RNA sequence: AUCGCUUCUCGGCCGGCUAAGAUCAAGUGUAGUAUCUGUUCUUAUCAGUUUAAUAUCUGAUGUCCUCUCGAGGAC
């Protein structure tokens, strides 16, 4: 249900979030996005 | 709207719009006792003959269409 | 012909470009000039969908009527941590506004636009109602003249302006009170 | 600034008059209609001095007015044709010295309209069903029956709708304990609108149509139609059944015509003119209104010209077949 | 004696001052509405009263800021301060004092044969009271035909600043429970109410 | 309410990373070059972080530099 | 002549009191009064495009009577 | 401030406010300011968005009853015959909304329209003078 | 798919169920119940006796019109019993 | 006085350790609108449809003859 296609908005916000918080905190970055989890954010980064 | 007489639309002609407002004016004249009496005073006739001439002018007014 | 059609009207100025294409111009000529009726808004034939945010980004958010300003609510309304919010539920404090029911039984009674000949359209705000003969306060201050603005002394010599030919400005052909020195 | 309004002298102009027994008394109270005003008078059998029992303002334009009675009933109600979209049935309580609103029914929009009823008003001699009509397109019927307690109850409406049809006048028709009939003067302008020449302006005769209400089938069907020779302004009920023939009189330009169905052929008579008249011959004549005088013995009619000439209209009948008509000069 | 009031058959009032030296006829103001005008009358210098062929009564007042000497289809206009539908066509308008020792008032006949008057309020108390009168009366005592009062007086033009006296007087004809209960909704008594409406009539007229 | 926190947090993040983006008299975000309106600043920022928004600044760049 | 160059101004003046200011004479159709970005302030010289040339030549004649902040205003053709 | 449009929902909701205000205040003599607001209401007439167009319809209906038809019709005249199809579609929709209700009271306000060759467009009854 | 029947308005009183109970029909609002609903027995008959004007359940009450639709005179049109198409 | 180095002084730009301490919120559907992004028409002329006017859509590239698109001749 959470799974789905990646969006330019979600992807850019992911850029900014990773820039601000740092690489090792995923749960904090998943908190800002909707319909995406921490694992998905990390694997989507790397 | 359609079944309500007097309904207009974008293609409405002059002639139809003015003959509408005519006929409605005439129904107002039939309606209001006074204004009718004013007409009877001005041009001398019976109330009756007034209403009769109006009922003659209901279909015609402005005359033939275009 | 759009030419000769302009001879049949008391105010032929009402006839416009697309007016000659009308299905019944021989009437619309007579309607559009009807005594007290108002013109159609102009935003069509402009494809912009009636507005853009150019001039609308420089506007103030809002400003209250003076009757509501004297009341004093403005200063009362003005921040909070989340645990203070769940404390605001557990603690809770009452009566932060503490309005005077006398005052709000007073203002709107004790204390407390445009005519029909106007209608709004897209870009119009200030202009029509700065004109030859009408200026703002401050620029009076820079000019520094006590209660003609002095280059209407030179509108004596060099002549009435080509740009606004209809002009009258005070004291010359226009026989003035407050700011407005010409009409 | 504010203005408080006062009436001082109430209007003396009388548009309508209806005579019925509203107190359940052998005397006849006269309900007359001033312009915006409903009014109730009591003339005296001996001295004739007209007593005003009630004067009331309805705060609305009265359009037409009729009185009726339930079959064989003791008393008479009032039907108020109004400028609103509501017909109202009224009863004058003799004790309380004022009217009560017996029935309020809403058939449509407000104000004098083209298509909205209340204009013309007719009712059955037996008081079964009252018919209300506008000038055009809408003719409605309310059926009346007294309740289990013999108190008046009104039915649901019906619809006579006929497209693009002007109604000159509507008059109740006499059929004793039958499916009721109604005489609607009509004309169609749809011929006139589609005729660019202007021929349909002429050569178009107003159609007389008798609608038949039917209780069992509980709708109103068009039944009778004849084209009228010349245009008459109004119609007159001719009491049928036991008393007299059942038919309608038609007051037409320079003529009156008894025009009826069955096998009954039309009977026309010219409107007599006075000897050596000073008026323009080009000015014709019709009748203004008529008051039927109905008696257990006989009956007749009273007609008037523009000039004020009241004639007594009579019927010469063979059984139920009227052979001819007799009009004697009555008064002025 | 100063200005001149033109009444159009269609477009209603045209304010015209005659300049004496130039002898020119000067239209400095006009109406904001078309109105078919029977006749006019002057409540004062700045106000005009007028009647409609359709049987309406309007009163239009100049703004106090009017320009007395000047040189869509107009420049400055006058607001319409009153609209009331009599339902009966009015052929004359005359302001006067009906009875000796009485208060100045406005007079209108009609074509129906009725004669009636318009009267100013000297207090906001009787004003608001008569307002509640009209209000609770209307719904609690509807007009007879089922037609609504408000619309009928707002018929051609919406009512502005007129209280209908003929509705207020019907307080007499209502049933004692109507009379009383309404007086309670008015917080008065039937004698209080009744006499207080007798006030205006008495003082101004018969 | 948790939803309210996200709105606050996604405005500030698009404020940090942020000279063209603004907020109109309403609450929406707008790019003053491109005259586009953005539902959320981050959503707006991406358009602000897009290659079309980029170009129209350069084109206006040249168009002014001439 | 449709445009004029205007020197010697004070930054409290902006494009608006120029708008208002020169339309007192005759309407400024196109206004240009630079905003300097770097220090966010105005040097005070202006360029004005009019409806046609006649406006602007009368503008040469009348035009240099304006005094912005007690001080002199240059207007010449361009 | 609201009816002057930041974004459509402002015009819509504000218009609804004008509606309910317009029904509520009826007959009490405040019409003037309602006319002023009608000015700013009036440009919003044109749009294809269903909610704003039906909103505006309710708006101008309430404004119809409050202001009285005469002023309405004086805004709705010129739009009837305008060359474009759009303007005619809409102003005829409006004019119908004004027409169905208060059809009785419209009579006085139809202006004078001169008579052509085949047709007589002047109603002379109103010009009978005693 | 859902629109008024608009048959002529009779003397029969309107009937609303539990759900629709408070709603003024046309304005969709709960405010100022004033006047009363009338629909034709053609729309209200039989299994429709005391039926909801809307959903088709048994009427527990009678619909009242608002004051809004009153002044705009919409309550005088054809019987406002919704028919599905 | 100048150059270079140095010292002092002043001015302008100018968040400890642990198991990373532990843990980690998403309703649906019917209609409908708005706002972002990406991509496409240098077509020439005429005729018709169409439009408020545009726009758009729909059709073909002076005629005849001879020779090998070009050339010549008759209009
Ligand atoms: Zn952009
Ligand atoms: Zn039905
Ligand atoms: Zn239900
Ligand atoms: Zn409602």
From Swiss-Prot, chain B:
The modification N6-acetyllysine is found at residue 3. GO terms for cellular component: nucleoplasm; nucleus; precatalytic spliceosome; SAGA complex; spliceosomal complex; U12-type spliceosomal complex; U2 snRNP; U2-type precatalytic spliceosome. Residues 1-62 are annotated as: Interaction with SF3B1 and SF3B3. One of its GO terms (biological process) is mRNA splicing, via spliceosome. The record marks 6 as: Interaction with RNA. GO terms for molecular function: RNA binding; splicing factor binding. Keywords: Acetylation, mRNA processing, mRNA splicing, Nucleus, Phosphoprotein, RNA-binding, Spliceosome. Its main location: nucleus. It is found in: Nucleus. Component of the 17S U2 SnRNP complex, a ribonucleoprotein complex that contains small nuclear RNA (snRNA) U2 and a number of specific proteins. Part of the SF3B subcomplex of the 17S U2 SnRNP complex. SF3B associates with the splicing subcomplex SF3A and a 12S RNA unit to form the U2 small nuclear ribonucleoproteins complex (U2 snRNP). Within the SF3B subcomplex, interacts directly with SF3B1 (via HEAT domain) and SF3B3. Component of the minor spliceosome, which splices U12-type introns. Belongs to the SF3B5 family. This is Splicing factor 3B subunit 5. The lineage of its organism: Eukaryota, Metazoa, Chordata, Craniata, Vertebrata. The gene is SF3B5.
Curated annotation (Swiss-Prot), chain E:
Residues 89-112 are annotated as: Interaction with SF3B5. The modification Phosphothreonine is found at residue 189. The record marks 160 as: Interaction with SF3B1. Signal peptide: none annotated. It is found in: Nucleus. Residues 32-53 are annotated as: Interaction with SF3B1. It comes from the Eukaryota. Belongs to the RSE1 family. Component of the 17S U2 SnRNP complex, a ribonucleoprotein complex that contains small nuclear RNA (snRNA) U2 and a number of specific proteins. Part of the SF3B subcomplex of the 17S U2 SnRNP complex. SF3B associates with the splicing subcomplex SF3A and a 12S RNA unit to form the U2 small nuclear ribonucleoproteins complex (U2 snRNP). Within the SF3B subcomplex, interacts directly with SF3B1 (via HEAT domain), SF3B5 and PHF5A. Identified in the spliceosome A complex; remains associated with the spliceosome throughout the splicing process. Component of the spliceosome B complex. Component of the 17S U2 SnRNP complex of the spliceosome, a large ribonucleoprotein complex that removes introns from transcribed pre-mRNAs. The 17S U2 SnRNP complex (1) directly participates in early spliceosome assembly and (2) mediates recognition of the intron branch site during pre-mRNA splicing by promoting the selection of the pre-mRNA branch-site adenosine, the nucleophile for the first step of splicing. The core of the protein consists of three beta-propeller domains. This is Splicing factor 3B subunit 3. It comes from Homo sapiens. The gene is SF3B3. The chain holds residues 997 to 1217 of 1217 of the full protein.
Curated annotation (Swiss-Prot), chain G:
It is found in: Nucleus. The modification Phosphotyrosine is found at residue 45. Residues 2-78 form the RRM domain. Belongs to the SF3B4 family. Component of the 17S U2 SnRNP complex of the spliceosome, a large ribonucleoprotein complex that removes introns from transcribed pre-mRNAs. The 17S U2 SnRNP complex (1) directly participates in early spliceosome assembly and (2) mediates recognition of the intron branch site during pre-mRNA splicing by promoting the selection of the pre-mRNA branch-site adenosine, the nucleophile for the first step of splicing. It is linked to Acrofacial dysostosis 1, Nager type: A form of acrofacial dysostosis, a group of disorders which are characterized by malformation of the craniofacial skeleton and the limbs. The major facial features of AFD1 include downslanted palpebral fissures, midface retrusion, and micrognathia, the latter of which often requires the placement of a tracheostomy in early childhood. Limb defects typically involve the anterior (radial) elements of the upper limbs and manifest as small or absent thumbs, triphalangeal thumbs, radial hyoplasia or aplasia, and radioulnar synostosis. This is Splicing factor 3B subunit 4. It comes from Homo sapiens. The chain holds residues 12 to 89 of 424 of the full protein.
Swiss-Prot record, chain H:
Residues 74-130 are annotated as: Interaction with SF3B3 and SF3B5. It is found in: Nucleus; Nucleus speckle. Phosphorylated. Phosphorylation occurs concomitantly with the splicing catalytic steps. Citrullinated by PADI4. It comes from Homo sapiens. Component of the 17S U2 SnRNP complex, a ribonucleoprotein complex that contains small nuclear RNA (snRNA) U2 and a number of specific proteins. Part of the SF3B subcomplex of the 17S U2 SnRNP complex. SF3B associates with the splicing subcomplex SF3A and a 12S RNA unit to form the U2 small nuclear ribonucleoproteins complex (U2 snRNP). Within the SF3B complex, interacts directly (via HEAT domain) with SF3B3, SF3B5, SF3B6 and (via HEAT domain) with PHF5A. The SF3B subcomplex interacts with U2AF2. Identified in the spliceosome C complex. Belongs to the SF3B1 family. HEAT repeats lie at residues 1-27. Component of the 17S U2 SnRNP complex of the spliceosome, a large ribonucleoprotein complex that removes introns from transcribed pre-mRNAs. The 17S U2 SnRNP complex (1) directly participates in early spliceosome assembly and (2) mediates recognition of the intron branch site during pre-mRNA splicing by promoting the selection of the pre-mRNA branch-site adenosine, the nucleophile for the first step of splicing. The chain holds residues 1175 to 1304 of 1304 of the full protein. Coiled coil: none annotated. This is Splicing factor 3B subunit 1.
